[PDB]
Amino acid sequence: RREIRVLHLLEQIRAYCETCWEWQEAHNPMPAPVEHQICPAVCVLMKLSFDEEHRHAMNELGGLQAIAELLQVDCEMYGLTNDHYSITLRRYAGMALTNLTFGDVANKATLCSMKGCMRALVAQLKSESEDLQQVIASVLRNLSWRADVNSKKTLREVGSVKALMECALEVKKESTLKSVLSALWNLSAHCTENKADICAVDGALAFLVGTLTYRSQTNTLAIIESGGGILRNVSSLIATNEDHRQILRENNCLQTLLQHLKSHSLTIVSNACGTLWNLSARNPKDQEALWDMGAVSMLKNLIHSKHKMIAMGSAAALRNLMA
């Protein structure tokens, strides 16, 4: 039976966590995960989380909570270890949390309500393991997509935004950057504080502008779309900040945004329209540059787009130039 199999595995990691918490109570030695064949149990649980029916059995047996607790406790016990076994364990746990959070309202809220785990998740963004960083950003991505108000507050309070922005300036692999930026894309929409935090990170704006012309030799637009989506979101705050505007000017942001108007990707066009909406508002200097770069002609043919953001964004930008 699926259910007995899932129960077995869940009981295994609960009993291990119980051991770990008992050790923690002590201000009698430290338990070891290898000793309890914990990584294999998580591994199977991870594999099974790709299957809908097994996911369902997990949800009936509080699987999410159990896997989250394990991740939390291993993070608290060993910190930012480079040990292969504990990193593996954390990866598999995170992959399973990702699978169980996707599209699941109740699971997302449950995970965010687990404060200690949320703190552990965020701390893992400073792990030297890019694979682990990728997985954690995947969890944060799901938790931040269409979240309820309390979850949005929690995600902000545990320092997700600054940790993700710093992580983005640092990561070496395109695959890691992709999920880091995806999560930032979601989070940057949530509140104005998140936007300020992104803009506050030294070099963040230059970096974001750089993603607009990212040389994706993996033949995708993922980085352009994500980086530019973050930029669109924080652009509303950039608009009110002369120094930040200047950083954009120094990296030819406006010029590039105009070329994104010609992109075949509706996501890209949509992002650029939103960004131009904000940057073309109440700034003679940038309005003037936009006029001189031929923005009007590029924007007028987008006002009838079927995509609401492109239509409104381009129309609003056009009106900002015409006023």
Binding site: F50, T98, F102, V135, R141, N142, R146, N186, G274
Partner: peptide, 10 residues
């Protein structure tokens, strides 16, 4: 002015 996406992948 909106979010990106969610997913299953690893």
């Amino acid at each position: 002015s909106y979010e990106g996406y969610e997913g299953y992948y690893s």
